[PDB]
């Protein structure tokens, strides 16, 4: 059934699974019209489909042309997400197809279930975890490829860079969710922590900076402090 704090280690076992986050699929800017009404302008979006064991990210860029002449776009966005996830699964060799797909938002369950009818053995699960994957567009290289797209495109990344050479998947996922939670809570402060030092660079083939083990401890501690601060700055504590 649902994925929660009690079955958290299941994410790192050897059954292939994927998280799907649709938060950033349909993105708009709201603005005033000349007549003083309000209108939206869509910008490019993305489906965030992530294997939490290996770090493999299937970033399907959603180009604004997919919304042209369509109605009820927030509803359509869930179905388009499910269409593209189903297309991705069908494109993978059988031995790479997931056994489970975990959606971060319960509204994706029916769309994905219906699109996956041909795969009755792939379990579609919700989660009780509040995962911070909406902040994926705070990762500069991901935001850049989404905004620059002129047509629908799939881009593959490893969201863990080379971390799995040194740490386990469990620890890598914990680091990723800490970084993303920080970026979600105070993006400016998080980016300052990461990228305030120009001497600590991001490899061309990576998303995050090339921190040593000891620098990651310092970074991770700075991210926790940021989240706790914002939690206080918020509720006043």
């Amino acid at each position: 059934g649902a994925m929660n704090s009690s079955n958290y280690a299941e994410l790192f076992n050897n059954d292939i699974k994927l998280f799907v986050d649709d938060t950033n699929v349909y993105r708009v800017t709201v603005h005033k019209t000349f007549e003083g009404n309000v209108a939206t302008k869509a910008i490019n979006g993305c489906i965030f489909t992530l294997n939490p064991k290996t770090g493999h990210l299937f970033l399907k860029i959603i180009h604004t042309s997919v919304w042209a002449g369509q109605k009820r776009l927030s509803q359509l966005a869930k179905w388009k997400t499910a269409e593209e996830v189903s297309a991705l699964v069908r494109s993978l060799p059988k031995e790479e197809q997931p056994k489970q797909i975990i959606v971060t938002r319960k509204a994706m369950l029916d769309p994905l279930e219906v699109h996956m009818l041909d795969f009755p053995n792939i379990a579609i699960r919700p989660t009780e975890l509040r995962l911070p994957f909406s902040a994926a567009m705070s990762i500069d290289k991901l935001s850049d490829v989404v905004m620059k797209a002129t047509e629908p495109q799939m881009v593959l990344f490893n969201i863990y860079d080379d971390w799995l050479d040194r740490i386990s998947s469990y620890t890598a996922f914990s680091r990723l969710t800490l970084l993303l939670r920080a970026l979600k809570t105070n993006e400016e402060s998080a980016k300052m922590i990461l990228l305030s030092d120009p001497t600590i660079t991001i490899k061309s083939y990576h998303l995050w900076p090339s921190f040593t083990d000891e620098q990651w401890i310092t970074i991770e501690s700075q991210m926790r402090d940021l989240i706790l601060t914002e939690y206080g700055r918020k509720y006043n504590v």
Binding site: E83, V114, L117, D118
Partner: protein, 300 residues
Amino acid sequence: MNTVPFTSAPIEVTIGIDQYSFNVKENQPFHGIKDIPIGHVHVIHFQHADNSSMRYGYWFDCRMGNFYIQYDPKDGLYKMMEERDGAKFENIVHNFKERQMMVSYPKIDEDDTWYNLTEFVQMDKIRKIVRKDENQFSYVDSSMTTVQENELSDPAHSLNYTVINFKSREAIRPGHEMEDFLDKSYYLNTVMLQGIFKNSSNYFGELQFAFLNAMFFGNYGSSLQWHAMIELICSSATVPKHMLDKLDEILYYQIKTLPEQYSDILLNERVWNICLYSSFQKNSLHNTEKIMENKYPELL
């Protein structure tokens, strides 16, 4: 006007005949029911005084044979049985009618309730949902499960209602996933009406039969089927006008007849709220919406 006579009544029992019911005492001199209107199916049903577990009963049509009820002390129930000798039957019945040992089907002349509840119900269709081909009548009880319930365990004792499942390949055309899930018209009109039921009369007949089994026996899988068949129509944007108007009449009489005290278990809040207030057909069921609001405003 036909007659379902009874060998005897050895155990105390509440006997139903269609929407009517009467209590018979242990060994009371009761020999059956007369004046049964010809032209409709009927159901004769039972609830024992000592064990309200298992309401059970028999669907029959007197045009198809001469039937009688006899208590079996081995299986412990009132059984329907057909009499193949027409003279013996006329002779046993006339004797029973002369001794005034039969209750009269108590139909008020103005009253069309039973016709309205069974308008599309045919015995030949009942006998395909309830499979026991050696008899012309059909046994149903509170506990019998449906084909669909069993798939999710004795097949010979099942209710073979048409399986309806909104998240199934049958309901969803490849390439029309969102379209078919949000508007069930292709599943209703092509798959079910044109393909399986052949016409709306057979569809309504199964819906009406499912309701009657839910009401008279508390049969849970029948209630599931009744609600699924309502939801499939209401969740379709394209439904022939004659079907929507007929559905409103069908449901109106079903809601009218339902015991006020059974609404908590026989009515699914989600389906009814969706059907009357959110669905494509939210404005096409005026009579049903009006009776539901005045009789069960809590559910909504």
